[PDB]
Symmetry: C3
Subunit: 40 residues, 3 copies
């Protein structure tokens, strides 16, 4: 399948990005997107 | 609750989208967002 | 590490946002991003 599973998910409030580690290929591919981060 | 849990999370480096399967309703609802994808 | 793990992930089709609860600090920080939501 073209969509691949996420194995780990982290987010960073300095860069305002979330990074998803992917099960694909050699293991070094990530998905990353801009995000808001805040204290509730 | 209006926010619902994600049961599975996949991402696709051809479409540059991540898709989250949701526990809601009949089970066929997803959340989907644009994302970057790259090799580290 | 500056990226921190997500402990829970929910998404909301009224607000069109996904919210990731973060393991950080006092436990009340989230990441949140706009998302599409739809029935497949
Ligand atoms: C002691 C200690 O340590 N403590 C700690 C702390 O520290 C941390 O915190 C952190 O801190 C830091 C330091 O201070 C910081 O940093 C900073 O920042 C800032 C700000 O930022 C922002 O802005 C910017 C600009 O514009 C940008 O870039 C960024 O990015 C940001 O923004 C963001 O972004 C994002 C992404 O894009 C987005 O998202 C999105 O969202 C959306 C929505 O939106 C909204 C709406 O709704 O619309 C908007 C609005 O506005 C809002 N509202 C309000 C009211 O606010 C909303 C809300 O929020 C909601 O709704 C609720 O629900 O939202 C959508 O969702 C989408 O999808 C998304 O995507 C957002 O929005 C944004 N926001 C805003 C507000 O805008 C900055 O600015 C700065 O930078 C500066 O500085 C530096 C140095 O330091 C440098 O490097 C740079 O370059 C800069 O510089 C500058 O420059 C300029 C020009 O160039 C000049 O002019 C000047 O002068 C300079 N300056 C200097 C100084 O140099 C900085 O970076 C940060 O921020 C903080 N963070 C936070 C989060 O807060 C704490 C935390 O931590 C963190 O996180 C965690 C988790 C972990 O990771 C760790 O590690 C980290 O660190 O913690 C504490 N502790 N404890 N517990
Ligand atoms: C052997 C084998 O097979 N191998 C394999 C491979 O293949 C793969 O890869 C893949 O491949 C494919 C094929 O080649 C490709 O495809 C292609 O692509 C291209 C590009 O794309 C891009 O661009 C476009 C346009 O513009 C768009 O649409 C897309 O989307 C993209 O873009 C992107 O997007 C995203 C989303 O929106 C974004 O995100 C974002 O991000 C942001 C940030 O950003 C940034 C910043 O920061 O600012 C930016 C910058 O720039 C950067 N920088 C650099 C330096 O780069 C940054 C960085 O990255 C960072 O920062 C780091 O940290 O970033 C934020 O975050 C936000 O939030 C987000 O959202 C992004 O950004 C973007 N990027 C850019 C760069 O821009 C395209 O173009 C193409 O298309 C074409 O072609 C086709 C056919 O083929 C067709 O269909 C189409 O239509 C087109 O066509 C064309 O048309 C035109 C007009 O219309 C004309 O003119 C021409 O002529 C034509 N042509 C033809 C040929 O026809 C295609 O599609 C892809 O790309 C690739 N991928 C990758 C990822 O790389 C690999 C991988 O795989 C994948 O993934 C995985 C995971 C899984 O899923 C699988 O299954 C898949 O496949 O693999 C390999 N193997 N192994 N190992
Ligand atoms: C019986 C019962 O109960 N049932 C149930 C139901 O109900 C639900 O559903 C829901 O419902 C509700 C009620 O009806 C609704 O609400 C409504 O809505 C509407 C619409 O919204 C939209 O629009 C708006 C405006 O513009 C906005 O704001 C929003 O946000 C939305 O939009 C969206 O957004 C997002 C974010 O930003 C985005 O995303 C993105 O995406 C992208 C992509 O994109 C696209 C592309 O591709 O390009 C686009 C295109 O278009 C598309 N296409 C088509 C064909 O469609 C595509 C596709 O989709 C794909 O591709 C596929 O694959 O896509 C990327 O990805 C990025 O990254 C992202 O981010 C998106 O896009 C968008 N979309 C569109 C389409 O645009 C609205 O409008 C409304 O509002 C109104 O109303 C209210 C009241 O009610 C009020 O408050 C307001 O204010 C408004 O008002 C108005 O105002 C105006 C002015 O101001 C005036 O003029 C008027 O008159 C007024 N009116 C009145 C009435 O007042 C509302 O809000 C919703 O929507 C729904 N949802 C859904 C999801 O559907 C169901 C579901 O549920 C939910 O979800 C779940 C999961 C859970 O959470 C729960 O709890 C919830 O509820 O369910 C059912 N049951 N059962 N089974």
């Amino acid at each position: 399948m073209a969509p691949v599973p996420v194995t780990k998910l982290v987010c960073d409030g300095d860069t305002y990005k979330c990074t998803a580690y992917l099960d694909f290929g050699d293991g070094r591919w990530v998905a990353q997107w801009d995000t808001n981060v805040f204290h509730t």
